[PDB]
Design a protein around this ligand. Structure first.
Ligand SMILES: CSc1scc2c1-c1nc(SCC(=O)C(C)(C)C)ncc1CC2
Length: 148
């Protein structure tokens, strides 16, 4: 159907349809999945093939995603330290997951917010705006710069 975008060598971004292609996940050495939704299934759980973390969030104007940054950053590096890839997904438009990737690219690549967004948008061209998440990523940049 569709293709889950490599952002880093171990970090992939996709929507809900991308996360249901089991064969591409096995092909890419994916062993970790972050599902940034409250309501979807963890798509291949009963198969016993992957480590999962759910971030139960909505694509809304009131949703806090900063709370999950540090928890999500650990799961990404555990996949890195163990040499397996990680897929982080939500749904079409990937607003919630892209926020998390962008936060990771700021914290662990010392990119600026806007340059991290430009980077992600280059590899993954359709990303729905959400000003609430933007404001969170701005206040995360400042906290990261002024001693987080
Ligand atoms: C980190 S976003 C960012 S930083 C500087 C700009 C932007 C931007 N992003 C988007 S879409 C993506 C989003 O809004 C997120 C869901 C990831 C928060 N549309 C317009 C703009 C204006 C320029």
């Amino acid at each position: 159907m569709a293709e889950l975008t490599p952002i880093l060598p171990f970090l992939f971004l996709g929507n809900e349809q991308d996360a249901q292609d089991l064969d591409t996940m096995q092909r890419l050495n994916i062993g970790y999945v972050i599902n940034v939704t409250t309501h979807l299934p963890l798509y291949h759980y009963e198969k016993g093939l992957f480590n999962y973390k759910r971030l139960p969030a909505t694509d809304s104007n009131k949703q806090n995603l900063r709370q999950y940054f540090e928890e999500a950053f650990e799961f990404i590096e555990e996949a890195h330290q163990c040499g397996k890839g990680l897929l982080i997904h939500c749904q079409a438009g990937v607003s919630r997951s892209a926020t998390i990737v962008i936060a990771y690219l700021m914290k662990h690549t010392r990119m600026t917010m806007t340059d991290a967004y430009k980077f992600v948008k280059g590899k993954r061209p359709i990303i729905g705006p959400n000003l609430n998440f933007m404001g969170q990523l701005l206040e995360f940049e400042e906290d990261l710069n002024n001693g987080v």
